[PDB]
Amino acid sequence: NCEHEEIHLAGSIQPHGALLVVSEHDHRVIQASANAAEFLNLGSVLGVPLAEIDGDLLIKILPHLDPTAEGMPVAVRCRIGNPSTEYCGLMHRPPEGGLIIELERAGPSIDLSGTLAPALERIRTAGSLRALCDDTVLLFQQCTGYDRVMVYRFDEQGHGLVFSECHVPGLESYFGNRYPSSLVPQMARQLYVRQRVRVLVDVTYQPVPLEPRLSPLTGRDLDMSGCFLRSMSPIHLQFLKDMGVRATLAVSLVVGGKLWGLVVCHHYLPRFIRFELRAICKRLAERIATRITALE
Numbered sequence: 001n002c003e004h005e006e007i008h009l010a011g012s013i014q015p016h017g018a019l020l021v022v023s024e025h026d027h028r029v030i031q032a033s034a035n036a037a038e039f040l041n042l043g044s045v046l047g048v049p050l051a052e053i054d055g056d057l058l059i060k061i062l063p064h065l066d067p068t069a070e071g072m073p074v075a076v077r078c079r080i081g082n083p084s085t086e087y088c089g090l091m092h093r094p095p096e097g098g099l100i101i102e103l104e105r106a107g108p109s110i111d112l113s114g115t116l117a118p119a120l121e122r123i124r125t126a127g128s129l130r131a132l133c134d135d136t137v138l139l140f141q142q143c144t145g146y147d148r149v150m151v152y153r154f155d156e157q158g159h160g161l162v163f164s165e166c167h168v169p170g171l172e173s174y175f176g177n178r179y180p181s182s183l184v185p186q187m188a189r190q191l192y193v194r195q196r197v198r199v200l201v202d203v204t205y206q207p208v209p210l211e212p213r214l215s216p217l218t219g220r221d222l223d224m225s226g227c228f229l230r231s232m233s234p235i236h237l238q239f240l241k242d243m244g245v246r247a248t249l250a251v252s253l254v255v256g257g258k259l260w261g262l263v264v265c266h267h268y269l270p271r272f273i274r275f276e277l278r279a280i281c282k283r284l285a286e287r288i289a290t291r292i293t294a295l296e
């Protein structure tokens with residue numbers, strides 16, 4: 001590989017959310033995505049006390065600063081800006097640099113109450129790895145609506161194999177395509193064991209830089225490992241562009257503390273899935289990984 005890119009030190013986000021970094025000590029915004037004021041209908045954010053950004057959010061965050069009960073990551077409802085809009089704030093604390101708050105607009109959900117159950121039933125009947133993975137791609141396509149859904153399985157040589165696939169009729173089948181191990185570098189695999197869902201809304205996005213780049217607390221790039229808005233590796237973006245894919249969802253399948261494979265979804269238009277469905281996807285994949293585990 002390909003093992004040298006520090007993909008967690010991206011210094012920028014995708015433009016469909018905003019990112020704030022709050023000091024644990026004075027609770028001011030010490031770093032933010034450059035779009036944050038515009039996205040949040042605020043005049044400014046950098047250097048502003050959280051009390052001014054939104055007092056209720058500050059009140060929400062304060063208990064999470066107890067080192068004996070940090071209770072993160074957490075997803076909180078908040079209302080910010082003037083005019084005021086509802087957001088989901090996904091908050092976590094990297095080892096250094098402060099408290100990160102990533103904000104997505106509240107919006108329409110996908111409703112799963114009539115369709116999740118038959119898809120899960122099918123998974124439960126699966127008696128082989130083949131059946132389980134075929135049922136996985138159907139379940140994730142039903143739940144998420146992506147144009148193509150795959151189980152990308154690492155073989156005994158670490159090559160990537162498109163082991164199961166479904167797609168909307170007329171699209172290309174990648175079923176059975178096999179790829180070099182380096183297309184998913186070990187460093188990326190390692191991150192994906194911890195950060196189990198990635199959503200790339202539009203491959204062609206213009207990254208939104210952090211301001212400042214370097215954390216004022218460390219003098220170093222911010223650790224964005226846990227950021228769902230993180231900008232992705234340009235080499236990977238180029239890969240997807242060369243295939244004509246516009247958006248992706250990827251969910252880790254973790255077995256034995258290692259990346260067994262991925263549920264990989266492609267869309268030919270921009271696509272976002274909101275917090276709750278990302279959480280559901282993560283859990284569904286953990287349940288499937290328990291089954292794989294058992295199947296050998």
Ligand SMILES: */C=C/C1=C(C)C(=O)N/C1=C\C1=NC(=C\c2[nH]c(/C=C3\NC(=O)C(C=C)=C3C)c(C)c2CCC(=O)O)/C(CCC(=O)O)=C1C
Pocket residue numbers: 001002005007152160162174179182183184185188198199200231232233235236239248249250251262264
């Ligand atoms: C030598 C390094 C690389 C080459 C060559 C390359 O093509 N990519 C290389 C590095 C990275 N890949 C990263 C992530 C990644 N790559 C894949 C590969 C595929 N996706 C597909 O849909 C298919 C085929 C159908 C292939 C072969 C996947 C699945 C992923 C993970 C994607 C995700 O989680 O969304 C990567 C890190 C990206 C990042 O997270 O920033 C690098 C550096």
